[model samples]
Target chain A: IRCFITPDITSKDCPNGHVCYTKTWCDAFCSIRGKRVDLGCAATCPTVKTGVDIQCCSTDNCNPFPT
Target chain B: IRCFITPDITSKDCPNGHVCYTKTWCDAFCSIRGKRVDLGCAATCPTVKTGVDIQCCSTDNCNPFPT
Candidate 1:
């Protein structure tokens, strides 16, 4: 469980440096599975405007990126 | 990983109904450990008012309780 994802989805599974590369945008640690009745993260991201802002969350990194 | 713990710390391990028993408060799905250099969850629960409102988060339950 972690959040704050964007641009560099090299295919998740972060926790090393817990990256945060900016220029356009790039946070790390990803994993938004479905739970409780079948899904979470606001019904699997119910608010992605496409440009950015897909803030999911569970309890690891807790969606962060401000390095 | 998950967050949002309280009252029923019952020693945590939630994900079934995801619980939301209020009277005082009792969300579920817990687990907020260290990472970055060593620890997280805002340096491990840095704003627990003691009565309630721990609200840690990662990316599953994402600190929820509004049933």
Candidate 2:
């Protein structure tokens, strides 16, 4: 799964990406603008107050960004 | 990179997901309502004629969905 994130992190500190799986739903997140944020996950996915354009997903390795 | 797709495909036939990378943008896609759709990528992302809720992103593994 993949997601766009905008956290207060640096290029080095940010996570490559992640898969968030709950019993009800699943989500993915990636680094955006040096912030770790979820792209677009589930309808009931939580909202990030700090992150910008937070998205979530449920597939493997879906997030793809430029170097 | 993860994107939600809604193509006329079966559960087994549909792609688990994919990473769409172009010179200008990169996107991810997944099956949604049996359609292949882009989640979200760059600002100039294209639209799907048949798929629903098409989105674009530039992060890896960002597209997620429920089983």
Candidate 3:
């Protein structure tokens, strides 16, 4: 079953080349996934994704996760 | 209605005792009626919960959802 997990950052912390700053993707991640998620980037800077991927993730309620 | 979809093996690939590691309730799976979920026995996990308040989500700098 698919599930939403938290990351460690916010859209603001997402850095300059990631999709975090976009609220659409963030919100979409929730709406589409049917849940909301976050990374510790909010009160921080440049969100980070863990696992072997180590990408950047965010929660700005900014965007949708895309279909 | 809630849909039943993909099932695999990963917080990166979840199994039982699911909920993927602990990172502040994984970004606060929103707070609406239903949505924002995760189910993978985290990296070094010992957490699991679902449907009946299966807690353990995170994002590092994590938090809540909208109204």
The clash numbers for all candidates, in the given order, read 9, 51, 44
Q: What is the DockQ of candidate 1?
A: 0.04
Q: Give Cα distance to truth, residue B65, candidate 1, Å.
A: 32
Can you write out model 1's per-residue Cα lDDT over B1-67, one digit (the tens) per residue?
Answer: 3311111112233333332222222334223311111112222334433445433444442433322
- Residue A1 accuracy (lDDT) in model 3: 20
DockQ of each: 0.04, 0.05, 0.07
- CAPRI level of candidate 3: incorrect
Q: Which numbered prediction scores highest in TM-score against the true structure?
A: 3
How far is A15's C-alpha from truth in model 2 (Å)? Answer: 43
Winning candidate number (DockQ)? 3
lDDT by residue (A1-67, candidate 1, tens digit) is 3211111212234333322221112234223311111112222334433334433554443433322
Interface RMSD of 3: 13.7
Per-model C-alpha RMSD: 16.2, 17.2, 14.1
Interface RMSD of each: 16.5, 16.9, 13.7
Question: Which consecutive 10 residues in model 2 chain B have the weakest lDDT in total?
Answer: B5-14
- Across residues B1-67, which tens digit of lDDT does each residue of candidate 3 receive? 1111122223333444333332223344345434444333453445345333344444431222222
